[PDB]
Amino acid sequence: PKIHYRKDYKPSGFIINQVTLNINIHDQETIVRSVLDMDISKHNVGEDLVFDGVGLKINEISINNKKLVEGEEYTYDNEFLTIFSKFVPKSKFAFSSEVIIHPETNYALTGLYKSKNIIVSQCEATGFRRITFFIDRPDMMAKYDVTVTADKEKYPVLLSNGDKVNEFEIPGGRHGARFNDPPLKPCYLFAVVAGDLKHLSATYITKYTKKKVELYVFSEEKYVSKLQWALECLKKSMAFDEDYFGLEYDLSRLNLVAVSDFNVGASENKGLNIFNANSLLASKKNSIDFSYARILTVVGHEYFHQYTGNRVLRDWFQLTLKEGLTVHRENLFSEEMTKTVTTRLSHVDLLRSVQFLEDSSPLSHPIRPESYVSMENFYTTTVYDKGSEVMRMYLTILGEEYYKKGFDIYIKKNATCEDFNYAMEQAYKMKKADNSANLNQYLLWFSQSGTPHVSFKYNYDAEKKQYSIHVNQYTKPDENQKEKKPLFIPISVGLINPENGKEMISQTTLELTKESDTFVFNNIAVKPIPSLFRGFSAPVYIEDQLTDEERILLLKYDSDAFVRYNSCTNIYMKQILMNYNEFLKAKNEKLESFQLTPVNAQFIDAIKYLLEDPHADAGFKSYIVSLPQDRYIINFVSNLDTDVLADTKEYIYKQIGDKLNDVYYKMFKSLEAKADDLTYFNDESHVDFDQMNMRTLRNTLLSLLSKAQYPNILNEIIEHSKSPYPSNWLTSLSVSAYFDKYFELYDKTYKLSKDDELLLQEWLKTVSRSDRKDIYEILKKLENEVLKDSKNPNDIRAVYLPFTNNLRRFHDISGKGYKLIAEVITKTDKFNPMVATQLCEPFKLWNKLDTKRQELMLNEMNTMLQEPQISNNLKEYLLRLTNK
Ligand SMILES: [Mg+2]
Ligand SMILES: [Mg+2]
Ligand SMILES: [Zn+2]
């Protein structure tokens, strides 16, 4: 296992100036001819010429049109092509090769592969080496001249980077297309698409230069009518980057292409973005509401890669520089487009659940790691989502005006993470009106792993009208740093007058730079309730040390969506932790009788208050009636007994339900007209995020009412199944799990879903997530009847991943759930190591569970590690997760 270190970076001893590709696609094989116009760099020390090349079948290789001989002049071990230095020229030379690859049987979905009837490429991060020989690293900038040939019937549409400069016929029913892309680019931004694609098109005219831009969205013929929303999102993305960042698209054409088989959401390439079908295609009739926010964000994300990618990555350790930034730009875009507070809330909810788990797991790493073995395991929620929060904090610190200045300085001057911090430091100096002000401490956000803990204590003096906020920050030591240093933590705060719910001070961002600090406020007429970390201004554990009474007041009257949301969350956690220990204590002591502390009555009253408030947001309401995610809860519990937590959740839901179920039912009925309005059902460009939030609320309330066995709720469930919206009649399936009509809706909703590839995958998720006692028997049914031996990641993930969130069933004390997923992981690892690693996600919290379940998970992981044919990808991941 070769380990790459960040501190060991050195520029290549070679230069690649021009790439001339000839990709000839045939029925059983794809022939790739490549001519590399190379040179010797100043960093050269007469070393061997080593190319990356994985799984390549060599027909012949040459230097200056002279064939090289195997063994005497070069060696190849299916991974590296080593050409001995004595046969390597000392000036400008040309390296040529012809290799054979097989996209048809490339089930790893990396490099060049075939998805259904579409040939597509995936080169990030180390995929280009699976297509042809190359110095496969992002700092190798080169020009590209690509020619693609194939059978005209099977692959009438040919796409690649740059301008299509020639189209020609080939004897035998074949055709060819030449693409020249003059601007320098790294090889992971190379792409090629071949297939029988249909499209929707539009013309975008830029804001300043008024350049006309051809926009194309591609898919297979069957689902071409699901491309409308993606096209609209693309238009929205371009306009936003123009309006907010003042950036225009540089090329004359942009292509979006959807494929059925894809490891992640999408990928960016210059002028040619390639999407997972579930993140590009949608229709009101064949998609749940989630697809619309999903497509918006993903289409936006890959577009925001364009302008930065056009002018500025030194090495893969700087991954968070382009990903953290893009996701940040993606999130700013989504918030502006959706105009809903739940958008920002959704991002925070994901970070504090998924990423916080990772950052306290053995897999914990900084957003810029010091080392890696597999680059495929580098693309984590830490690099992406914590990285985004780090990039977002720049905006919070600098403000909108100065941030755009710092951003413009970054784009114009350029790279590494330090380069971006430098540009922001320049804006920081301007804002602070001082050249001695710096952001050197801020770099610790890039190098320090783990989640910081921020705790508070307060003091108010009525006589002097003086309010003090004592802040403390702390990060637990891990395997990355023995000693943790204080970070630059921006704390957006407000002060709420508890008597009238008014703001007491203007916008304020506390700059915590030390381990602890005391912030004092004068002329505070009355004792305030602090509104801390507004908008979640820092990726930290917040310990407000407020009473439930104070939290309730914030929940009702604070202006900031997150602090309201977080206050409700904190009230829940306090209740959860209390009831958990009470349930646990009874279990450990085998008590015949015991007591549970009821849910705060005033808290329940506050929920009723907000719910019955017509001017309150529907999406926000859905959050406050829902307990915190299980993966968020586990961060606050040692040796988590999943059964006890399940009992705890059940009791708390029942407590609140016993009070508010009538309110829940009344709202479910009254919300129907606006939530399920069909006015624009066949207007595929009309998306109402507020309306979809109303359906989110209705479906959430229906779920609560179903679990509570509300009187005659089955009637509502049945009628809900007749709704035109997939979000509704799929919800009816899952909530009917507690009734004898589950399998009736099972067949009904299957018939509705089976003829759409993406919709069926949503049906699989719904079944997988169904709260059924016979869930293991049901999963077997999906395997034999629906899933079978499919190698489609969307199919495999849909069947198994939602099931892993079943607290009671997946964590069955027998370990049957752990054994099931482990078998799926090992099975998947044979053809797709990346997806196999994705399926390991349930095991990420293994050392946080009770001792018995720790043992069970560890055994299955050790079993997987003992598999003789385990991939390096999977091996490295499990080794790090099990601290071996
Ligand atoms: Mg091969
Ligand atoms: Mg990507
Ligand atoms: Zn990205």
GROMACS .gro file of C-alpha atoms in nm, residues 651-845:
model
  195
  651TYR     CA    1  -4.195   0.743   2.424
  652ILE     CA    2  -4.120   1.105   2.333
  653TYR     CA    3  -4.320   1.088   2.008
  654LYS     CA    4  -4.607   0.929   2.201
  655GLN     CA    5  -4.591   1.200   2.469
  656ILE     CA    6  -4.617   1.480   2.212
  657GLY     CA    7  -4.868   1.285   2.004
  658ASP     CA    8  -5.100   1.231   2.300
  659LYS     CA    9  -5.131   1.610   2.316
  660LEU     CA   10  -5.116   1.723   1.954
  661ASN     CA   11  -5.258   1.445   1.733
  662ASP     CA   12  -5.587   1.631   1.689
  663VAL     CA   13  -5.388   1.937   1.581
  664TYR     CA   14  -5.187   1.718   1.343
  665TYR     CA   15  -5.502   1.578   1.182
  666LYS     CA   16  -5.669   1.918   1.144
  667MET     CA   17  -5.362   2.056   0.967
  668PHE     CA   18  -5.331   1.750   0.742
  669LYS     CA   19  -5.685   1.814   0.619
  670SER     CA   20  -5.658   2.193   0.584
  671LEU     CA   21  -5.320   2.185   0.408
  672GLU     CA   22  -5.450   1.954   0.133
  673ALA     CA   23  -5.587   2.215  -0.109
  674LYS     CA   24  -5.267   2.420  -0.134
  675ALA     CA   25  -5.021   2.132  -0.099
  676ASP     CA   26  -5.175   1.907  -0.364
  677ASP     CA   27  -5.277   2.182  -0.608
  678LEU     CA   28  -5.261   2.044  -0.962
  679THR     CA   29  -5.280   2.378  -1.144
  680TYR     CA   30  -4.924   2.351  -1.281
  681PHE     CA   31  -4.888   1.973  -1.273
  682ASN     CA   32  -4.805   1.955  -1.642
  683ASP     CA   33  -4.597   2.270  -1.632
  684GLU     CA   34  -4.260   2.103  -1.589
  685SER     CA   35  -4.085   2.440  -1.553
  686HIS     CA   36  -4.308   2.557  -1.267
  687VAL     CA   37  -4.154   2.455  -0.933
  688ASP     CA   38  -4.300   2.577  -0.604
  689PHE     CA   39  -4.067   2.498  -0.314
  690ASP     CA   40  -4.315   2.636  -0.060
  691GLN     CA   41  -4.582   2.401  -0.194
  692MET     CA   42  -4.349   2.101  -0.176
  693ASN     CA   43  -4.271   2.195   0.184
  694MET     CA   44  -4.645   2.187   0.252
  695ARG     CA   45  -4.651   1.830   0.121
  696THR     CA   46  -4.346   1.756   0.335
  697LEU     CA   47  -4.549   1.871   0.636
  698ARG     CA   48  -4.859   1.673   0.536
  699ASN     CA   49  -4.659   1.356   0.479
  700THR     CA   50  -4.473   1.410   0.806
  701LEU     CA   51  -4.798   1.461   0.996
  702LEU     CA   52  -4.954   1.159   0.824
  703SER     CA   53  -4.656   0.949   0.933
  704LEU     CA   54  -4.698   1.067   1.292
  705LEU     CA   55  -5.072   0.997   1.283
  706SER     CA   56  -5.015   0.652   1.132
  707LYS     CA   57  -4.763   0.546   1.396
  708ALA     CA   58  -5.001   0.674   1.664
  709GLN     CA   59  -5.280   0.465   1.511
  710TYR     CA   60  -5.505   0.771   1.492
  711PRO     CA   61  -5.877   0.682   1.457
  712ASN     CA   62  -5.970   0.595   1.097
  713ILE     CA   63  -5.638   0.729   0.966
  714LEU     CA   64  -5.628   0.433   0.727
  715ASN     CA   65  -5.900   0.607   0.527
  716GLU     CA   66  -5.670   0.905   0.479
  717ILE     CA   67  -5.384   0.673   0.384
  718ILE     CA   68  -5.590   0.499   0.115
  719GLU     CA   69  -5.706   0.829  -0.036
  720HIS     CA   70  -5.348   0.956  -0.016
  721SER     CA   71  -5.243   0.666  -0.238
  722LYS     CA   72  -5.470   0.797  -0.513
  723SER     CA   73  -5.283   1.128  -0.528
  724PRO     CA   74  -5.109   1.224  -0.855
  725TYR     CA   75  -4.791   1.322  -0.668
  726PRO     CA   76  -4.531   1.042  -0.618
  727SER     CA   77  -4.423   1.201  -0.288
  728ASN     CA   78  -4.777   1.135  -0.165
  729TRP     CA   79  -4.862   0.785  -0.291
  730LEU     CA   80  -4.516   0.657  -0.199
  731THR     CA   81  -4.567   0.803   0.149
  732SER     CA   82  -4.897   0.615   0.164
  733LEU     CA   83  -4.701   0.294   0.109
  734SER     CA   84  -4.454   0.351   0.392
  735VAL     CA   85  -4.710   0.474   0.645
  736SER     CA   86  -4.941   0.181   0.566
  737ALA     CA   87  -4.677  -0.049   0.714
  738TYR     CA   88  -4.869  -0.043   1.042
  739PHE     CA   89  -5.181  -0.178   0.870
  740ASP     CA   90  -5.304  -0.491   0.693
  741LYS     CA   91  -5.327  -0.303   0.363
  742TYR     CA   92  -4.951  -0.261   0.328
  743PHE     CA   93  -4.901  -0.533   0.068
  744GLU     CA   94  -5.206  -0.403  -0.118
  745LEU     CA   95  -5.040  -0.064  -0.165
  746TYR     CA   96  -4.713  -0.251  -0.219
  747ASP     CA   97  -4.848  -0.397  -0.544
  748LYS     CA   98  -5.039  -0.080  -0.636
  749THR     CA   99  -4.738   0.150  -0.602
  750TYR     CA  100  -4.513  -0.104  -0.773
  751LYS     CA  101  -4.734  -0.101  -1.082
  752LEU     CA  102  -4.713   0.279  -1.078
  753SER     CA  103  -4.334   0.274  -1.051
  754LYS     CA  104  -4.212  -0.023  -1.256
  755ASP     CA  105  -4.215   0.148  -1.597
  756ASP     CA  106  -3.987   0.433  -1.489
  757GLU     CA  107  -3.628   0.345  -1.400
  758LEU     CA  108  -3.580   0.631  -1.153
  759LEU     CA  109  -3.929   0.609  -1.004
  760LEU     CA  110  -3.887   0.236  -0.940
  761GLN     CA  111  -3.567   0.316  -0.752
  762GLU     CA  112  -3.768   0.553  -0.533
  763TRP     CA  113  -4.019   0.274  -0.481
  764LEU     CA  114  -3.731   0.050  -0.374
  765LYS     CA  115  -3.617   0.311  -0.121
  766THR     CA  116  -3.970   0.340   0.017
  767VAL     CA  117  -4.001  -0.036   0.060
  768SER     CA  118  -3.649  -0.053   0.204
  769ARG     CA  119  -3.736   0.216   0.458
  770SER     CA  120  -4.074   0.062   0.545
  771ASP     CA  121  -4.121   0.012   0.919
  772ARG     CA  122  -4.210  -0.356   0.880
  773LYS     CA  123  -4.163  -0.644   1.123
  774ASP     CA  124  -4.110  -0.874   0.825
  775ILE     CA  125  -3.861  -0.636   0.664
  776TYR     CA  126  -3.593  -0.905   0.622
  777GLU     CA  127  -3.839  -1.128   0.437
  778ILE     CA  128  -3.939  -0.825   0.229
  779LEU     CA  129  -3.577  -0.744   0.143
  780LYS     CA  130  -3.540  -1.102   0.019
  781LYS     CA  131  -3.845  -1.045  -0.201
  782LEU     CA  132  -3.687  -0.737  -0.359
  783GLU     CA  133  -3.368  -0.932  -0.426
  784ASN     CA  134  -3.538  -1.220  -0.606
  785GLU     CA  135  -3.811  -1.027  -0.789
  786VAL     CA  136  -3.676  -0.678  -0.857
  787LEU     CA  137  -3.305  -0.627  -0.785
  788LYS     CA  138  -3.162  -0.962  -0.899
  789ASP     CA  139  -2.800  -0.940  -1.017
  790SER     CA  140  -2.811  -0.573  -1.116
  791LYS     CA  141  -2.480  -0.386  -1.107
  792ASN     CA  142  -2.654  -0.049  -1.116
  793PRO     CA  143  -2.543   0.148  -0.805
  794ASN     CA  144  -2.878   0.328  -0.795
  795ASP     CA  145  -3.052  -0.009  -0.765
  796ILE     CA  146  -2.818  -0.152  -0.502
  797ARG     CA  147  -2.816   0.162  -0.287
  798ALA     CA  148  -3.195   0.201  -0.306
  799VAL     CA  149  -3.257  -0.151  -0.178
  800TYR     CA  150  -3.012  -0.161   0.112
  801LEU     CA  151  -2.913   0.186   0.238
  802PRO     CA  152  -3.255   0.310   0.359
  803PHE     CA  153  -3.295  -0.018   0.550
  804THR     CA  154  -2.975   0.057   0.742
  805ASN     CA  155  -3.155   0.353   0.901
  806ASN     CA  156  -3.407   0.116   1.058
  807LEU     CA  157  -3.300   0.153   1.422
  808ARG     CA  158  -3.474  -0.158   1.558
  809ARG     CA  159  -3.434  -0.396   1.264
  810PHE     CA  160  -3.095  -0.320   1.110
  811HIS     CA  161  -2.936  -0.327   1.455
  812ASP     CA  162  -3.098  -0.660   1.544
  813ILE     CA  163  -2.901  -0.811   1.832
  814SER     CA  164  -2.841  -1.129   1.630
  815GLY     CA  165  -2.633  -0.926   1.386
  816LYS     CA  166  -2.833  -1.045   1.086
  817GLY     CA  167  -2.846  -0.688   0.959
  818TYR     CA  168  -2.471  -0.639   0.983
  819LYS     CA  169  -2.417  -0.974   0.811
  820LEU     CA  170  -2.659  -0.881   0.533
  821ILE     CA  171  -2.489  -0.553   0.439
  822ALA     CA  172  -2.143  -0.709   0.473
  823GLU     CA  173  -2.241  -0.972   0.216
  824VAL     CA  174  -2.370  -0.698  -0.015
  825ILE     CA  175  -2.047  -0.500   0.028
  826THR     CA  176  -1.827  -0.801  -0.051
  827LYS     CA  177  -2.048  -0.891  -0.348
  828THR     CA  178  -2.038  -0.535  -0.482
  829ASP     CA  179  -1.662  -0.502  -0.426
  830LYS     CA  180  -1.605  -0.760  -0.700
  831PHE     CA  181  -1.714  -0.514  -0.969
  832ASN     CA  182  -1.745  -0.173  -0.802
  833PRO     CA  183  -1.504  -0.097  -0.512
  834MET     CA  184  -1.623   0.265  -0.477
  835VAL     CA  185  -1.990   0.175  -0.430
  836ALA     CA  186  -1.884  -0.110  -0.200
  837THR     CA  187  -1.712   0.151   0.017
  838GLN     CA  188  -2.028   0.363   0.007
  839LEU     CA  189  -2.221   0.065   0.143
  840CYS     CA  190  -1.990   0.058   0.446
  841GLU     CA  191  -2.146   0.380   0.580
  842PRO     CA  192  -2.359   0.201   0.844
  843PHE     CA  193  -2.038   0.068   1.003
  844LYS     CA  194  -1.894   0.417   1.053
  845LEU     CA  195  -2.045   0.440   1.403
   0.00000   0.00000   0.00000
